[PDB]
Every structure is written in structure tokens, then in C-alpha cells.
Amino acid sequence: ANKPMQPITSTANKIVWSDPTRLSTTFSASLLRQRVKVGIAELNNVSGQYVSVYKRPAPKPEGCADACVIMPNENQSIRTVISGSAENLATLKAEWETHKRNVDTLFASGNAGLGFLDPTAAIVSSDTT
Amino acid sequence: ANKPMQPITSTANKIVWSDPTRLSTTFSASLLRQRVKVGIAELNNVSGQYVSVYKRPAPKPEGCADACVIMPNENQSIRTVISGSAENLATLKAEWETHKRNVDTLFASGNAGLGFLDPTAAIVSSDTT
Amino acid sequence: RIDSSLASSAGFVVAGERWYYTKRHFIIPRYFQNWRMRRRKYVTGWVMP
Amino acid sequence: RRPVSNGNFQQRVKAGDIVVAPYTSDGKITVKLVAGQKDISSTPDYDYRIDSSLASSAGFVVAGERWYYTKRHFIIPRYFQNWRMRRRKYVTGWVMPTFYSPKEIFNRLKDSLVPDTGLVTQVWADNNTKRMDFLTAMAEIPQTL
């Protein structure tokens, strides 16, 4: 039941998505690949940088969801940059959900969004026992 | 079970975790709080940075060097910064998983990892019908 | 009937064999036994345009 | 042996070609036939008792020449004779079995040589699976082109 969006700017590097219903929100993806020899051996490094921004005005004073009371808009931007060797993409993928849960534990389920920090929060790595 | 990761450097802003077994892998989560006034009402702004870096040696060329030697280690980095006001984390949580679901189609399922886009992708916004 | 493995990966949360379509519930690819399939007898022959 | 050369083998390998060719080994096929006795008739016969100690002392207790089967009784098969046999005068000759020559055996075998369609199909499917994997991976390239 989630409204999809459709591309705006098409490029060999950048694709810009945006909702026709609400043009404020958008999601774009640009990526740059580089031809690299790190240990005198060639590597396929691809750097996919992703932005997702939503202009959601939600101060919403206490119990005042009542009438035509418009609030000024505020920004919510999410920047993600994934860079690594394409040959090791399979395990690079495997590392990726580890980043998901790690952020989710400390922030989504934790309380890092308010600006607090818990050094004792359970942080786990990709490899297993 | 995946091996737990323990902090190495704790601070009111930056906490850096690392695996005791191999400390080369790191997960540094930095915070950056500022005061933003927009709608004649100060709002709590948090710029939550999360950097997950894993190191996996070489693409391991077949034969030849597979005796006692390893080609220099590569770097795999995923950087994420989350912005927005702290008064509306509830919607920030909702969009984050939406961003998670959005990035998955391009990266986890699509071939964006190898470096090729997909203008015919199917992404959706945080909001719902 | 059979199953529907290799269907899709996005949205589903993979936990080994378990594919979580939601936070708590999950489905399994080789246990998804709800599809009706037609397989037919075919006589074929190469043709030269 | 029927070996076949592909010409400039190494040159073609450097060019990047895979090579196949029929081959045969210097194998050998042997046929050995061993003659046997062929009984044709018999008539005379005679009954022998003599000795019945051909068997060993399994299931008996050995005490000198005594074969103890119970704690109070024993036998000496050197003198304990209770089995009577029959011996006849068979008439036998040398019969020589015959078999086909390895020449025609190998001819029939090479005529019967037929590739395994099931194995061929299975191996083709095994290759085609990873072929499809790579095709699906590479499908996006001409779009960039």
C-alpha cells in the first residue's frame, strides 16, 4: 500500500527518483567506479552513493492536530555511500546487513537518534563463530 | 552466532568498536548535534554519522600465490549519516527502513553493486496510501 | 504444485532458510506449496526461415 | 592406437581455442580357454568303508587320539568307522570349450559403442545453469553500450 515514485533525471551515472504526488521527497543514486591496483593487483572498486531526503513538516504542537494550522517544513536527509571491490560483492553484500542491524540496534531500537550514546550497546561484526 | 565487537575508544561524541579477534574491522558511530530554529520554535537537530569498515584480503588469485602469501588487504567501507529533528524520530524510524528497503532493491537484489544502474527499478516513498 | 524458490530477495528478510516477509512471521522458499502449474506434452520441429 | 594431432596446438591455445579430438588406447583383449573332463558313461561300482576321518575335530574335545564329544564318551576316528561310500568307474574325455576371437569381440564392442544421452543431457544442463547465471549478470552491458 506504499506509493511508488518514478525517475526524473536519467544519466549514465545518476538516476533521480521523485514522487509525483509530493515532489518534495526524492531518492537519487549516483555511483562512480575506479580502476585501482591496491596490492599491485587490479581491483574493481564501485562507489555507490545514495541520498534520500524528505521535507516533512512535523513540529505539530501538543494535541493540536485540529485544524488548518500549517507548520514550516524541516529537512530529513539520509546519505549512504557504499564503496568496495565488485569481485568481493557477495561478501560485501553480507557485510551490508551487518551494517543494517548494527545501526538498527544502537539507533533504530537504541536511543542514538535523540543524540545519546550507549557504549554498552550490542555491536556485532560480519563474521561468525 | 556472529562474533561480538567491543569498543576501543569511547567519547561523548564518537564511540569506535572493534573485534577483539581482529581489530582491523571497525564500526565508528559519530554524533553531531546542533540547534536549528525554523518555525519560531527551536528544534533538536541530530546529525548521526555511522561508518562501518571491514577489511578482507585480496580477491585471492588462483594458484601461483596460494602457498604462504596474501596479496595486500583491501578496504570495504559503508558510510551512513542520518539528519533531521529529534522531535520526530518516529517518522525518521519509518523512513529509515524505507530507505533500507529502497537501497536493497538497487543493491541487495539489483546489480547496482557491480556498477550498473536500473532505471526500471521499483522504489517507494516512506509514506503509505 | 512444487514451490517458488528464487522468487525475490528485496523486502523479504532472509534468515537461513527462513525468509521474513514481516518483522516476526516468515516464509520458506521450498515450503511455499500454493502454486498450480501446467506442464504439457509438446511435439516440436526445427523450421528454416 | 589411433592418435590425432591438432597442428599448432600451443598456437591455437594462445589464440584462445578449446580443442577436442577422438582418441584410442593401445588396449589389449585376450580370450583364454581351459579344457575340462567330459563324463560320458559309467557302470562299475564298489562300496568302501575304510576310514571316515577326513573331517577335522570341530565340535569335539581333543585328548590324544580321543575325540571327546561328551564328558563320559569319546571316539577315535582313526578306528571309528561308520560312514560307507560308493566308488564308480567313470568314463571321461578331454572337452575343449570354445569362444569367439578378441578380433570380432572388439569389432562387436566398437559397433555397440553409443554415447549416453542421459549423461549428455545432464552435463549440458549443468553447464547451462552457470551459463544462465553469467548471462543474467551480463545482461545490463549492452544497455550501457
Add this chain to the structure above:
Amino acid sequence: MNMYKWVPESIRDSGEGQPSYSNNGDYAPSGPWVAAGIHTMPQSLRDSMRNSIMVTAQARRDVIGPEWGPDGRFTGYASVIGTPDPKPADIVNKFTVE
């Protein structure tokens, strides 16, 4: 000759699925689970993955490409009956303008 061929574009979701309800309250691959009703699976996602299977099966058709899965998971399947028919070679005719 005859050729067993897979027949896409003629499928239906019979609703015999049994989603499993994890008692662990997470994406844990262990612990207890309960079989749940198929009403929980979204119609839109069900249709999406059904169409994905449709396009994959259509692509893997008349190819004799894959075989039947060791676990029973089918693919685009084509079983040969008897000897397969020989396929004529793709001929070429070329002309050069002088």
C-alpha cells in the same frame, strides 16, 4: 520426436501456503515457530514474486537449460523424449560490393 516443455502463463496461487510465525520475536533462524495463515502475505508482494517467477520461467523455456532441482525446486524444464531432433546449422550468405 516429442519434447516435454514447461508451460508458463497458466499458473494460479492456490492458497496452500503456510507462513511460519516465529516465537522469538525477531529474524532469528532458530527457536520455535508456528504455522500461520496465508492471509498475512500481502497481495501486491505475492503478485510481484509470482510475476518474477513468470518472467524467469518464460526466459527459461524451450532451452533444455536447467534440470529439476535436487530438492525438487523446478526451473524452466525441458525433458527430452527419445533422441533429440538435430538442429540445422545457422547458414550464412554473403555478398561483397565491388
Add this chain to the structure above:
Amino acid sequence: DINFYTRQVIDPRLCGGLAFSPKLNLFRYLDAMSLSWNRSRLKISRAT
């Protein structure tokens, strides 16, 4: 006693197909619109 080895071709006239033949799914693919780069070639030739 029989012991020998033989190797045989897959007589590609009869067998040797039964595969995907990667000609297809690429020949039916963009070969037309990619050829349609005649537009760009005409553009560059005009200014050439």
C-alpha cells in the same frame, strides 16, 4: 579380459546444441535501437 580407452566427439551436427545458444536473447535485444545510433552519426557527419 578387456582393457582399453576411447574418446569420442559429440557429433555437433546431431548433438552439440540443446543449449541456450547465446545468439538469442541478445539478437532479439537492442540490436535495432543500438543500430539507430545512425541518428548520432548523421548529427556528427553534418558538422564534420
Add this chain to the structure above:
RNA sequence: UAAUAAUGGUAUGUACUAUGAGUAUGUAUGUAGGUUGAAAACCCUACCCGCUUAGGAUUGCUUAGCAGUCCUUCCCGGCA
């Protein structure tokens, strides 16, 4: 061995900006030497790595199918 330089580059971090990875900056320019200066060491030597040139390797061998390489030359690149 080598200096004048145009040292318009690249990669990696910093502060601002960011519905942008743009701005400016530090650092280093495959590995070590000679060298003033513009010490971001310009350039030559030596050693590695990847291109290119056109020649080759037992080209046949194999009771199995090999093999996805190796050497030299032309050869331009891994700071200008």
C-alpha cells in the same frame, strides 16, 4: 642523473556547504637512488606491475583430455 618548469592530475583525510559530493586545504604520488629549484622532486638510473608490437614454446601429446600460461622484442603507462 636533469634543470627551467605549465608542476591544469590522481588517491586518501580535514572544515564549510549539501534535495552537491561541490568548495578549500593537509598528506602521498608502484619500489629505492642522484639532483638545485617551483620540496606536491622537476627529471635520469635500477627493480617490480599492467598495456601495446609480432614472434616463438614438444606442437603435439594423451588408457585424462590437456590450457586459460610462459620468454623476448616494439611498447606506453603506475606525479605532472
